[PDB]
Amino acid sequence: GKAKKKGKSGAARNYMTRTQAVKKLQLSLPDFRKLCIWKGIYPREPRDRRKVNKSATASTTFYYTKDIQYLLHEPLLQKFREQK
Amino acid sequence: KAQIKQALKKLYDIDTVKINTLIRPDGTKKAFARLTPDVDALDIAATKLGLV
Amino acid sequence: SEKAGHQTSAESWGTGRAVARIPRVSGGGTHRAGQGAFGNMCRSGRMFAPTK
């Protein structure tokens, strides 16, 4: 039917960078790294990183979108905000 | 079409290769479902549907 | 009822050559259109000196 657009599906939806992850979770970088270590969120590698992000380099860290969405429901985020 | 093929599969174990749908002048939807060549539509109509 | 015979829109066709100058119900497509109204001598009209 309607024509799909480029970059709206595939690895672009499968992965996100660390910047997009911290902006999605609205966390500081130490809290994000701490929560990733505690919950077992591991860095990933796409086959083509340019399909995920055009500004990605060899040092860019990637995570799974479903992993970040699973982190989005962690009760420790409320604890972080309460402590702040 | 996806809902029709899913309902056919989970009702009568029917595998369809394609489905064409129209809406009749009386307001109901009519669906033509073409089956896989391995299964026989005449056998399905005789046994599962009872259309003889 | 104080509205009896006055729940119509009717106007006299004027002095002419054919019909009397009673007010006649406007419109079309029904028997009521063109018929007289508001008179005590008219069918379905207000009577003379309605009772209070």
Binding site: - | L11, L49, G50, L51, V52 | -
Partner: protein
Amino acid sequence: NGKVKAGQLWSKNKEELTKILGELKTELSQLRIQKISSSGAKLNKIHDLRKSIARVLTVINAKQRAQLRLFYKNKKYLPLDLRPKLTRALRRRLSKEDASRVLEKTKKRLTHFPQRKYAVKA
């Protein structure tokens, strides 16, 4: 067959009620094709299964709502469907305690000078 009494349904719990609902829906789906293929006494049966499906759904919904009311028995906020309906004006009306609150000066005056019970001799 196919006319399930409500007295039988009021003793079952959730899973076998869903099983009965499924088998009634399956037999209804079969007997609609039987209706369009031939004419017989099966029309009474499809009417019976339609009413049986209605009864099973009613029983399941009633038990679900009773369990939810028991869960929300002692909580401050209830779901809007479980809250009492009344009317909109009745819901926005002041509560009986807020309507019966009086000032402390009024409380003192009503405490020490209430309406007395009296009679006048003739």
